[PDB]
Design a protein around this ligand. Structure first.
Ligand SMILES: CCCc1cc2c(NCCc3ccc(OCc4nnn[nH]4)cc3)nc(OC)nc2s1
Lengths: 157, 47, 244, 61
């Protein structure tokens, strides 16, 4: 259809959730409507590494350098790791073979794509199919972002 | 300004009070945009 | 008279040096971490605390007694009001995250100045009212011991004391409470320890002042020196705890 | 800088500093008030009570 929206409340805090990926039109024409959104939640497929990851990295690069998103914070979720651990053996991460090395290399090759390091931060996470601590991570990141913005506005930071 | 203007300004004041209350309430919601590539497990993340 | 004057001059020079240091480096992260506008106001209050000695050694006149009545309360009020507002905005900022994504009211670099000036103006109002009730005057007092080389004194030194003192004590209590509330903040934004030590040391100094003032009712000169030294010491305690 | 039981060492340090301050303030007052006995006893009593209260509140709170 169009844009899909969801509500959920956590720790007496209100959360608007905007799914927009189904628009299927020119992103640059309407992307500016979302200036001022507190956080951007990105999702990266790990098991789709052999190249889909080049496309995913290019898409990530574009979002960081958009002019509207100069000061917005990025929350990154790395999914499909349960299959990734087994896929390393069949397809090495070069396409020091290990789970930790591949995870660190992926994390570094993404996190090294924001020039204005001082302006914004890139929270990073590893998510599995089943985990109840994801919402706690979102809460603990959003509160930090809010505090940083309030401090920067008054000149204290 | 006969009673017509008085009624108009009273109604305008009620509208402005309602708008201010709604905006103050709605300034507390935390908005989160979702992005990624297709078939990247976004449905599982949302669920 | 030489001693207290020398101490006051040294204190004024030290305050000027500290102010010049903060000005030169006003863009560094640690200076921005603290309020700059309230830091300047607090430094001005410390400077006035030192300057009060010259007023208290000048020959009494129709104008000098008025300055003696105003500045004494005004300096303390300035310093404590600055501390109260500075700690308050940080406490509210770190407490506001519970509500969520709501910009706190009156946290601009200009609203704080307004609040601090209002708090000072309250004390100014009290002092001016009591000044209107009893006009300043320069009496020449002599005592039942006919010997007394007639002394030259102000008219009603004690008229406004209790009101100003009560106000200042209320401000100190509020400052201590807001220092307690903010003990869990990050390192650069947390100063509860220094505020506690400042308040404790100041209270100790004035408690020590009391008996020396009582026992030296004779030889007024001793009383004046034991008030100039106490005021300068209070200013120095504030400066050392907060800025060093 | 030694955390043993909820970092009591720094609390001991705070108690020591405060007691030093109280004793420094009190010692000259006795000689200055040697002239009058009533105020001398009153100040001694007040100083002793405060010296106990500092240790109590600073360390055991
Ligand atoms: C913890 C609380 C600290 C404070 C203390 C304090 C204070 N105390 C000084 C009071 C005093 C003592 C002897 C005097 O007699 C001497 C004299 N006076 N004129 N000529 N000789 C006069 C005044 N004054 C004021 O402002 C009013 N604010 C404060 S805040």
């Amino acid at each position: 259809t169009g844009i899909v929206e969801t509500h959920f409340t956590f720790k007496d805090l209100h959360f608007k959730m905007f799914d927009v990926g189904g628009q299927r039109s020119e992103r640059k024409k309407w992307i500016h409507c979302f200036e001022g959104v507190t956080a951007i939640i990105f999702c990266v497929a790990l098991s789709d590494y052999d190249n889909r990851m080049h496309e995913s990295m290019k898409l990530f690069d574009s979002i960081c350098n958009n002019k509207w998103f100069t000061d917005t914070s990025i929350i990154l979720f790395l999914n499909k790791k349960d299959l990734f651990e087994e896929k390393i053996k069949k397809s090495p991460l070069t396409i020091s073979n290990t789970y930790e090395e591949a995870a660190a290399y992926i994390q570094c090759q993404f996190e090294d794509l924001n020039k204005r390091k001082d302006t914004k931060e890139i929270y990073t996470h590893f998510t599995c199919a089943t985990d109840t601590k994801n919402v706690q991570f979102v809460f603990d990141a959003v509160t930090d972002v809010i505090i940083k913005n309030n401090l920067k506005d008054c000149g204290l930071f | 300004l006969s009673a017509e203007d008085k009624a108009a300004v009273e109604r305008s004041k009620m509208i402005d009070r309602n708008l201010r209350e709604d905006g103050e309430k709605a300034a507390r919601e935390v908005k989160l945009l979702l992005l990624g590539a297709g078939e990247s497990g976004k449905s599982t993340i949302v669920k | 008279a030489v001693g207290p004057v020398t101490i006051a001059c040294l204190g004024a020079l030290a305050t000027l040096f500290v102010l010049g240091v903060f000005v030169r480096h006003n863009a560094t992260p640690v200076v921005k971490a603290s309020g700059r506008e309230l830091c300047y106001i607090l430094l001005g209050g410390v400077f006035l605390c030192y300057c009060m000695t010259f007023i208290f050694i000048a020959k009494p006149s129709t104008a000098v007694c008025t300055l003696r009545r105003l500045g004494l309360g005004t300096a303390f009020s300035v310093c404590y009001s600055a501390l109260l507002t500075k700690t308050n905005r940080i406490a509210r900022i770190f407490g506001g995250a519970r509500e969520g994504a709501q910009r706190p009211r009156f946290i601009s670099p200009a609203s704080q100045v307004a609040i601090c000036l209002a708090l000072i103006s309250g004390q100014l109002l009290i002092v001016v009212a009591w000044l209107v009730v009893e006009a300043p005057g320069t009496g020449k007092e002599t005592a039942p011991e006919r010997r007394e080389v007639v002394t030259l004194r102000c008219n009603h030194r004690d008229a406004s004391m209790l009101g100003s003192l009560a106000y200042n004590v209320l401000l100190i209590a509020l400052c201590t409470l807001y220092a307690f509330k903010t003990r869990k903040c990050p390192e650069n934004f947390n100063e509860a320890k220094f505020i506690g030590f400042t308040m404790y040391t100041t209270c100790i100094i004035w408690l020590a002042f009391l008996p020396i003032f009582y026992v030296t009712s004779s030889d007024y000169r001793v009383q004046t020196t034991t008030m100039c030294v106490s005021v300068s010491l209070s200013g120095s305690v504030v400066l050392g705890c907060l800025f060093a």
